[PDB]
Tab-separated table of all heavy atoms in Angstrom:
chain	number	residue	atom	x	y	z
A	29	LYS	N	-23.024	-18.512	-14.818
A	29	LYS	CA	-22.629	-17.327	-15.568
A	29	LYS	C	-21.128	-17.422	-15.858
A	29	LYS	O	-20.637	-16.888	-16.848
A	29	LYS	CB	-22.933	-16.066	-14.759
A	29	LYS	CG	-22.497	-14.783	-15.425
A	29	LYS	CD	-22.966	-13.576	-14.634
A	29	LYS	CE	-22.356	-12.303	-15.196
A	29	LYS	NZ	-22.893	-11.113	-14.505
A	30	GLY	N	-20.407	-18.117	-14.982
A	30	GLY	CA	-18.977	-18.290	-15.166
A	30	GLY	C	-18.119	-17.139	-14.668
A	30	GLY	O	-17.170	-16.732	-15.337
A	31	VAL	N	-18.430	-16.628	-13.483
A	31	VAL	CA	-17.673	-15.522	-12.921
A	31	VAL	C	-16.344	-15.961	-12.319
A	31	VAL	O	-16.289	-16.941	-11.586
A	31	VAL	CB	-18.485	-14.796	-11.833
A	31	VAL	CG1	-17.655	-13.701	-11.211
A	31	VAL	CG2	-19.747	-14.207	-12.445
A	32	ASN	N	-15.287	-15.227	-12.651
A	32	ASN	CA	-13.936	-15.480	-12.150
A	32	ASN	C	-13.617	-14.362	-11.160
A	32	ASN	O	-13.508	-13.198	-11.550
A	32	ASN	CB	-12.902	-15.433	-13.289
A	32	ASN	CG	-13.272	-16.317	-14.466
A	32	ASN	OD1	-13.859	-15.853	-15.451
A	32	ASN	ND2	-12.935	-17.603	-14.370
A	33	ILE	N	-13.466	-14.710	-9.888
A	33	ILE	CA	-13.168	-13.712	-8.866
A	33	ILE	C	-11.762	-13.911	-8.317
A	33	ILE	O	-11.399	-15.025	-7.953
A	33	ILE	CB	-14.136	-13.826	-7.683
A	33	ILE	CG1	-15.583	-13.713	-8.167
A	33	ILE	CG2	-13.830	-12.741	-6.662
A	33	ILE	CD1	-16.594	-14.000	-7.091
A	34	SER	N	-10.973	-12.844	-8.265
A	34	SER	CA	-9.627	-12.927	-7.707
A	34	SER	C	-9.483	-11.882	-6.590
A	34	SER	O	-10.136	-10.836	-6.610
A	34	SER	CB	-8.569	-12.702	-8.795
A	34	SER	OG	-8.663	-11.411	-9.363
A	35	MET	N	-8.653	-12.187	-5.601
A	35	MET	CA	-8.427	-11.281	-4.486
A	35	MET	C	-6.944	-11.216	-4.137
A	35	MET	O	-6.285	-12.244	-4.012
A	35	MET	CB	-9.205	-11.744	-3.255
A	35	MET	CG	-8.864	-10.960	-1.998
A	35	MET	SD	-9.839	-11.488	-0.591
A	35	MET	CE	-8.995	-13.008	-0.116
A	36	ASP	N	-6.430	-10.004	-3.985
A	36	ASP	CA	-5.032	-9.809	-3.624
A	36	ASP	C	-5.027	-8.871	-2.421
A	36	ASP	O	-4.963	-7.651	-2.566
A	36	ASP	CB	-4.268	-9.186	-4.790
A	36	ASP	CG	-2.770	-9.231	-4.593
A	36	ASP	OD1	-2.322	-9.598	-3.483
A	36	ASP	OD2	-2.042	-8.898	-5.553
A	37	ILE	N	-5.133	-9.459	-1.235
A	37	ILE	CA	-5.164	-8.716	0.014
A	37	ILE	C	-4.170	-9.331	0.993
A	37	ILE	O	-4.260	-10.510	1.331
A	37	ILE	CB	-6.582	-8.741	0.620
A	37	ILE	CG1	-7.491	-7.806	-0.187
A	37	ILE	CG2	-6.542	-8.358	2.092
A	37	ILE	CD1	-8.885	-7.678	0.378
A	38	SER	N	-3.216	-8.525	1.438
A	38	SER	CA	-2.193	-9.005	2.361
A	38	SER	C	-2.808	-9.476	3.673
A	38	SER	O	-3.853	-8.977	4.094
A	38	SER	CB	-1.174	-7.899	2.631
A	38	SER	OG	-0.137	-8.372	3.467
A	39	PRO	N	-2.165	-10.445	4.342
A	39	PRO	CA	-2.707	-10.941	5.612
A	39	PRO	C	-2.714	-9.887	6.722
A	39	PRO	O	-3.354	-10.070	7.758
A	39	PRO	CB	-1.802	-12.136	5.930
A	39	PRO	CG	-0.489	-11.729	5.323
A	39	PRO	CD	-0.917	-11.146	3.989
A	40	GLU	N	-2.010	-8.785	6.498
A	40	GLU	CA	-1.928	-7.704	7.476
A	40	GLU	C	-3.208	-6.853	7.538
A	40	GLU	O	-3.567	-6.326	8.595
A	40	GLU	CB	-0.721	-6.823	7.146
A	40	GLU	CG	-0.558	-6.565	5.652
A	40	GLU	CD	0.553	-5.582	5.322
A	40	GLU	OE1	1.747	-5.954	5.399
A	40	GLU	OE2	0.222	-4.424	4.986
A	41	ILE	N	-3.901	-6.738	6.408
A	41	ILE	CA	-5.131	-5.945	6.329
A	41	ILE	C	-6.216	-6.439	7.285
A	41	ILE	O	-6.591	-7.614	7.279
A	41	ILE	CB	-5.694	-5.943	4.882
A	41	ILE	CG1	-4.626	-5.451	3.906
A	41	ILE	CG2	-6.930	-5.050	4.797
A	41	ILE	CD1	-4.173	-4.016	4.142
A	42	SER	N	-6.724	-5.543	8.119
A	42	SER	CA	-7.762	-5.933	9.051
A	42	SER	C	-8.862	-4.894	9.132
A	42	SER	O	-8.738	-3.789	8.610
A	42	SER	CB	-7.163	-6.163	10.438
A	42	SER	OG	-6.622	-4.961	10.949
A	43	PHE	N	-9.947	-5.277	9.788
A	43	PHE	CA	-11.100	-4.420	9.975
A	43	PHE	C	-11.396	-4.294	11.467
A	43	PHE	O	-11.376	-5.286	12.205
A	43	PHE	CB	-12.314	-5.024	9.265
A	43	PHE	CG	-13.614	-4.405	9.672
A	43	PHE	CD1	-13.977	-3.148	9.201
A	43	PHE	CD2	-14.461	-5.062	10.557
A	43	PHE	CE1	-15.171	-2.554	9.610
A	43	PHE	CE2	-15.649	-4.480	10.973
A	43	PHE	CZ	-16.006	-3.222	10.497
A	44	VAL	N	-11.676	-3.072	11.904
A	44	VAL	CA	-11.999	-2.812	13.299
A	44	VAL	C	-13.502	-2.563	13.433
A	44	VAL	O	-14.047	-1.667	12.779
A	44	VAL	CB	-11.251	-1.571	13.820
A	44	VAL	CG1	-11.525	-1.386	15.288
A	44	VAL	CG2	-9.763	-1.705	13.551
A	45	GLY	N	-14.171	-3.345	14.276
A	45	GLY	CA	-15.604	-3.169	14.454
A	45	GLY	C	-16.363	-4.485	14.439
A	45	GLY	O	-15.764	-5.548	14.535
A	46	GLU	N	-17.683	-4.423	14.325
A	46	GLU	CA	-18.494	-5.634	14.301
A	46	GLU	C	-18.218	-6.433	13.033
A	46	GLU	O	-18.562	-6.003	11.933
A	46	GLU	CB	-19.973	-5.268	14.354
A	46	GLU	CG	-20.901	-6.446	14.567
A	46	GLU	CD	-21.345	-6.587	16.013
A	46	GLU	OE1	-20.941	-5.755	16.855
A	46	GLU	OE2	-22.104	-7.533	16.309
A	47	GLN	N	-17.605	-7.597	13.194
A	47	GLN	CA	-17.277	-8.449	12.061
A	47	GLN	C	-18.467	-8.686	11.131
A	47	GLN	O	-18.306	-8.732	9.910
A	47	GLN	CB	-16.741	-9.789	12.564
A	47	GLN	CG	-16.410	-10.771	11.463
A	47	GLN	CD	-15.950	-12.110	12.000
A	47	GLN	OE1	-14.883	-12.218	12.606
A	47	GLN	NE2	-16.757	-13.139	11.782
A	48	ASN	N	-19.658	-8.835	11.707
A	48	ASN	CA	-20.870	-9.068	10.917
A	48	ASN	C	-21.183	-7.925	9.960
A	48	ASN	O	-21.730	-8.145	8.877
A	48	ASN	CB	-22.076	-9.280	11.832
A	48	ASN	CG	-22.081	-10.645	12.485
A	48	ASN	OD1	-22.946	-10.944	13.310
A	48	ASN	ND2	-21.116	-11.486	12.117
A	49	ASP	N	-20.861	-6.703	10.370
A	49	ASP	CA	-21.116	-5.547	9.523
A	49	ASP	C	-20.220	-5.588	8.290
A	49	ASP	O	-20.696	-5.419	7.173
A	49	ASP	CB	-20.883	-4.246	10.295
A	49	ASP	CG	-21.840	-4.082	11.461
A	49	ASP	OD1	-22.984	-4.572	11.367
A	49	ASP	OD2	-21.456	-3.452	12.468
A	50	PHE	N	-18.928	-5.824	8.487
A	50	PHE	CA	-18.006	-5.886	7.353
A	50	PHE	C	-18.460	-6.977	6.387
A	50	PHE	O	-18.492	-6.773	5.172
A	50	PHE	CB	-16.587	-6.195	7.824
A	50	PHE	CG	-15.581	-6.264	6.707
A	50	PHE	CD1	-15.018	-5.107	6.190
A	50	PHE	CD2	-15.189	-7.489	6.186
A	50	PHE	CE1	-14.067	-5.165	5.171
A	50	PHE	CE2	-14.249	-7.563	5.171
A	50	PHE	CZ	-13.682	-6.397	4.660
A	51	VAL	N	-18.812	-8.140	6.932
A	51	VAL	CA	-19.264	-9.242	6.096
A	51	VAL	C	-20.564	-8.908	5.362
A	51	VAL	O	-20.740	-9.293	4.206
A	51	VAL	CB	-19.448	-10.533	6.920
A	51	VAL	CG1	-20.168	-11.589	6.087
A	51	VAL	CG2	-18.086	-11.057	7.351
A	52	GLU	N	-21.462	-8.179	6.020
A	52	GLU	CA	-22.725	-7.794	5.393
A	52	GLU	C	-22.524	-6.747	4.293
A	52	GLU	O	-23.173	-6.802	3.253
A	52	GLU	CB	-23.706	-7.264	6.442
A	52	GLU	CG	-25.105	-7.024	5.892
A	52	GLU	CD	-26.128	-6.716	6.971
A	52	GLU	OE1	-25.769	-6.726	8.171
A	52	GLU	OE2	-27.300	-6.461	6.615
A	53	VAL	N	-21.622	-5.797	4.516
A	53	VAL	CA	-21.341	-4.765	3.519
A	53	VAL	C	-20.646	-5.360	2.301
A	53	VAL	O	-21.028	-5.107	1.149
A	53	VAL	CB	-20.410	-3.662	4.088
A	53	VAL	CG1	-19.863	-2.788	2.943
A	53	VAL	CG2	-21.160	-2.818	5.092
A	54	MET	N	-19.617	-6.153	2.562
A	54	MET	CA	-18.859	-6.745	1.475
A	54	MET	C	-19.662	-7.793	0.728
A	54	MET	O	-19.492	-7.957	-0.474
A	54	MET	CB	-17.548	-7.327	1.995
A	54	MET	CG	-16.572	-6.257	2.467
A	54	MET	SD	-16.447	-4.792	1.366
A	54	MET	CE	-16.047	-5.515	-0.180
A	55	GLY	N	-20.541	-8.488	1.437
A	55	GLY	CA	-21.372	-9.481	0.783
A	55	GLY	C	-22.226	-8.784	-0.270
A	55	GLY	O	-22.379	-9.281	-1.392
A	56	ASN	N	-22.763	-7.617	0.088
A	56	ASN	CA	-23.598	-6.825	-0.819
A	56	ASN	C	-22.802	-6.258	-2.014
A	56	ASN	O	-23.239	-6.351	-3.169
A	56	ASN	CB	-24.278	-5.689	-0.026
A	56	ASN	CG	-25.167	-4.804	-0.897
A	56	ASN	OD1	-25.653	-5.232	-1.951
A	56	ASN	ND2	-25.402	-3.568	-0.447
A	57	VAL	N	-21.630	-5.687	-1.747
A	57	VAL	CA	-20.820	-5.110	-2.819
A	57	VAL	C	-20.285	-6.177	-3.790
A	57	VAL	O	-20.248	-5.964	-5.006
A	57	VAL	CB	-19.641	-4.277	-2.238
A	57	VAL	CG1	-18.745	-3.753	-3.365
A	57	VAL	CG2	-20.190	-3.105	-1.442
A	58	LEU	N	-19.883	-7.326	-3.255
A	58	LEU	CA	-19.362	-8.402	-4.087
A	58	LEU	C	-20.485	-9.013	-4.916
A	58	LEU	O	-20.299	-9.323	-6.096
A	58	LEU	CB	-18.691	-9.479	-3.217
A	58	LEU	CG	-17.404	-9.017	-2.512
A	58	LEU	CD1	-16.796	-10.142	-1.670
A	58	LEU	CD2	-16.412	-8.550	-3.568
A	59	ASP	N	-21.650	-9.190	-4.301
A	59	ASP	CA	-22.777	-9.756	-5.024
A	59	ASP	C	-23.144	-8.846	-6.188
A	59	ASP	O	-23.385	-9.302	-7.301
A	59	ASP	CB	-23.980	-9.924	-4.104
A	59	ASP	CG	-25.173	-10.526	-4.826
A	59	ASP	OD1	-25.097	-11.721	-5.194
A	59	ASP	OD2	-26.176	-9.802	-5.036
A	60	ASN	N	-23.166	-7.547	-5.928
A	60	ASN	CA	-23.498	-6.580	-6.952
A	60	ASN	C	-22.478	-6.653	-8.094
A	60	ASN	O	-22.841	-6.613	-9.273
A	60	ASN	CB	-23.502	-5.181	-6.333
A	60	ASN	CG	-24.431	-4.238	-7.046
A	60	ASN	OD1	-24.012	-3.206	-7.571
A	60	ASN	ND2	-25.715	-4.591	-7.066
A	61	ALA	N	-21.196	-6.779	-7.744
A	61	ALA	CA	-20.143	-6.840	-8.755
A	61	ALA	C	-20.301	-8.078	-9.627
A	61	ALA	O	-20.075	-8.032	-10.834
A	61	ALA	CB	-18.768	-6.812	-8.086
A	62	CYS	N	-20.703	-9.189	-9.020
A	62	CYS	CA	-20.913	-10.404	-9.798
A	62	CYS	C	-22.063	-10.218	-10.778
A	62	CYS	O	-22.015	-10.721	-11.898
A	62	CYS	CB	-21.230	-11.584	-8.891
A	62	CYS	SG	-19.799	-12.196	-7.997
A	63	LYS	N	-23.105	-9.507	-10.359
A	63	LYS	CA	-24.247	-9.286	-11.244
A	63	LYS	C	-23.900	-8.410	-12.440
A	63	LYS	O	-24.320	-8.690	-13.566
A	63	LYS	CB	-25.413	-8.658	-10.474
A	63	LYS	CG	-26.101	-9.609	-9.521
A	63	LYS	CD	-27.192	-8.910	-8.730
A	63	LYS	CE	-27.940	-9.905	-7.864
A	63	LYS	NZ	-29.044	-9.269	-7.096
A	64	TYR	N	-23.132	-7.349	-12.212
A	64	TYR	CA	-22.778	-6.462	-13.317
A	64	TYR	C	-21.583	-6.829	-14.153
A	64	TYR	O	-21.452	-6.371	-15.291
A	64	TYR	CB	-22.598	-5.037	-12.829
A	64	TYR	CG	-23.911	-4.451	-12.472
A	64	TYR	CD1	-24.312	-4.454	-11.166
A	64	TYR	CD2	-24.791	-3.946	-13.448
A	64	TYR	CE1	-25.548	-3.971	-10.797
A	64	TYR	CE2	-26.052	-3.452	-13.083
A	64	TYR	CZ	-26.411	-3.466	-11.734
A	64	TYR	OH	-27.575	-2.919	-11.277
A	65	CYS	N	-20.701	-7.647	-13.604
A	65	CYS	CA	-19.519	-8.037	-14.343
A	65	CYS	C	-19.915	-8.895	-15.535
A	65	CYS	O	-21.045	-9.378	-15.627
A	65	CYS	CB	-18.586	-8.859	-13.448
A	65	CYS	SG	-19.037	-10.627	-13.371
A	66	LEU	N	-18.974	-9.070	-16.453
A	66	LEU	CA	-19.194	-9.945	-17.586
A	66	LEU	C	-18.636	-11.310	-17.134
A	66	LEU	O	-19.334	-12.331	-17.179
A	66	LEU	CB	-18.455	-9.425	-18.825
A	66	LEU	CG	-18.593	-10.297	-20.075
A	66	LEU	CD1	-20.065	-10.550	-20.363
A	66	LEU	CD2	-17.918	-9.623	-21.254
A	67	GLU	N	-17.389	-11.324	-16.671
A	67	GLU	CA	-16.784	-12.566	-16.200
A	67	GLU	C	-15.673	-12.350	-15.164
A	67	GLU	O	-15.235	-13.304	-14.526
A	67	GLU	CB	-16.220	-13.367	-17.375
A	67	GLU	CG	-15.087	-12.664	-18.076
A	67	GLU	CD	-14.470	-13.484	-19.197
A	67	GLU	OE1	-14.642	-14.723	-19.214
A	67	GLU	OE2	-13.793	-12.881	-20.058
A	68	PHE	N	-15.219	-11.113	-14.994
A	68	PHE	CA	-14.158	-10.851	-14.023
A	68	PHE	C	-14.500	-9.886	-12.895
A	68	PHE	O	-15.162	-8.866	-13.099
A	68	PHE	CB	-12.903	-10.336	-14.736
A	68	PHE	CG	-12.247	-11.361	-15.612
A	68	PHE	CD1	-12.366	-11.291	-16.997
A	68	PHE	CD2	-11.527	-12.411	-15.051
A	68	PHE	CE1	-11.777	-12.258	-17.812
A	68	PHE	CE2	-10.938	-13.380	-15.856
A	68	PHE	CZ	-11.061	-13.304	-17.238
A	69	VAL	N	-14.033	-10.234	-11.702
A	69	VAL	CA	-14.209	-9.416	-10.509
A	69	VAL	C	-12.882	-9.489	-9.754
A	69	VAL	O	-12.339	-10.584	-9.543
A	69	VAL	CB	-15.327	-9.955	-9.601
A	69	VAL	CG1	-15.366	-9.158	-8.297
A	69	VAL	CG2	-16.662	-9.876	-10.322
A	70	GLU	N	-12.355	-8.333	-9.362
A	70	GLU	CA	-11.084	-8.285	-8.649
A	70	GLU	C	-11.201	-7.484	-7.360
A	70	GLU	O	-11.779	-6.398	-7.335
A	70	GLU	CB	-9.990	-7.685	-9.538
A	70	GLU	CG	-9.489	-8.612	-10.629
A	70	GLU	CD	-8.332	-8.007	-11.409
A	70	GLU	OE1	-7.479	-7.341	-10.782
A	70	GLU	OE2	-8.259	-8.199	-12.640
A	71	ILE	N	-10.644	-8.033	-6.290
A	71	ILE	CA	-10.716	-7.390	-4.992
A	71	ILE	C	-9.322	-7.035	-4.490
A	71	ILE	O	-8.391	-7.830	-4.612
A	71	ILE	CB	-11.373	-8.327	-3.971
A	71	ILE	CG1	-12.689	-8.874	-4.545
A	71	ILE	CG2	-11.615	-7.581	-2.664
A	71	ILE	CD1	-13.327	-9.931	-3.699
A	72	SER	N	-9.185	-5.839	-3.923
A	72	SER	CA	-7.907	-5.394	-3.370
A	72	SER	C	-8.207	-4.512	-2.156
A	72	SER	O	-9.375	-4.207	-1.871
A	72	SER	CB	-7.082	-4.639	-4.426
A	72	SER	OG	-7.726	-3.465	-4.890
A	73	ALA	N	-7.177	-4.119	-1.420
A	73	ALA	CA	-7.415	-3.298	-0.247
A	73	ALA	C	-6.190	-2.522	0.196
A	73	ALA	O	-5.058	-2.863	-0.155
A	73	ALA	CB	-7.903	-4.166	0.892
A	74	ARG	N	-6.433	-1.462	0.951
A	74	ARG	CA	-5.369	-0.625	1.493
A	74	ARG	C	-5.872	-0.013	2.785
A	74	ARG	O	-7.072	0.216	2.941
A	74	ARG	CB	-4.984	0.479	0.507
A	74	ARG	CG	-4.520	-0.041	-0.830
A	74	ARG	CD	-3.810	1.029	-1.626
A	74	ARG	NE	-2.566	1.438	-0.982
A	74	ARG	CZ	-1.635	2.184	-1.567
A	74	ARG	NH1	-1.810	2.602	-2.814
A	74	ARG	NH2	-0.529	2.507	-0.910
A	75	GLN	N	-4.963	0.244	3.719
A	75	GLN	CA	-5.357	0.837	4.992
A	75	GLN	C	-4.610	2.133	5.275
A	75	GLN	O	-3.517	2.364	4.755
A	75	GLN	CB	-5.066	-0.109	6.162
A	75	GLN	CG	-5.569	-1.520	6.020
A	75	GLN	CD	-5.232	-2.361	7.240
A	75	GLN	OE1	-5.901	-2.284	8.267
A	75	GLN	NE2	-4.173	-3.153	7.137
A	76	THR	N	-5.228	2.971	6.100
A	76	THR	CA	-4.640	4.225	6.567
A	76	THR	C	-4.972	4.207	8.061
A	76	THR	O	-6.006	3.676	8.459
A	76	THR	CB	-5.261	5.473	5.891
A	76	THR	OG1	-6.678	5.491	6.101
A	76	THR	CG2	-4.976	5.460	4.402
Side-chain angles (χ1 to χ4, degrees):
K29 177 174 172 175
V31 177
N32 308 96
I33 304 172
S34 63
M35 172 178 78
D36 192 351
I37 286 184
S38 183
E40 41 174 75
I41 305 297
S42 64
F43 166 76
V44 184
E46 190 99 1
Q47 178 183 293
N48 285 176
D49 297 329
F50 180 82
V51 169
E52 188 171 358
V53 166
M54 292 317 305
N56 180 24
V57 176
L58 293 180
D59 180 69
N60 208 240
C62 286
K63 288 177 175 181
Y64 289 97
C65 83
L66 179 53
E67 64 177 340
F68 293 105
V69 174
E70 286 185 38
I71 310 173
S72 62
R74 301 195 65 168
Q75 310 180 79
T76 57

